[PDB]
Design a protein around this motif. Structure first.
Motif: not given
Lengths: 48, 48
Positions: A13-27
């Motif tokens: 029920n709890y998943r996460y983003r392990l890899f990303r091509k760029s940095n995600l902005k806050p909020f």
């Protein structure tokens, strides 16, 4: 919550983003599952 | 290096220490002069 949330071998029920091509902005909530490309090999939207 | 005529034997496998120069691995990757090329932990683009 280990005495509660922990279920047998895992809790899906709890998943996460392990890899990303760029940095995600806050909020910001990005649900994009797009395959992450670490190297120069084209991913073509699939693992490899 | 990989196009050189002769190599050392496997049991004798030679390790050449090279330092203090510039090298472009993006051309060698796009040169199509290799049968197999794979990197671990560092992409060929990050090397440059």
């Amino acid at each position: 919550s280990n005495n509660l949330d922990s279920k047998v071998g895992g809790n899906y029920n709890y998943r996460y983003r392990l890899f990303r091509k760029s940095n995600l902005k806050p909020f910001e909530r990005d649900i994009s599952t797009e395959i992450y490309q670490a190297g120069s090999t084209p991913c073509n939207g699939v693992q490899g | 290096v990989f196009n050189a005529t002769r190599f050392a034997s496997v049991y004798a496998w030679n390790r050449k220490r090279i330092s203090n120069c510039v090298a472009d691995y993006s051309v060698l990757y796009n040169s199509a002069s290799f049968s197999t090329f794979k990197c671990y932990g560092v992409s060929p683009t990050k090397l440059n």
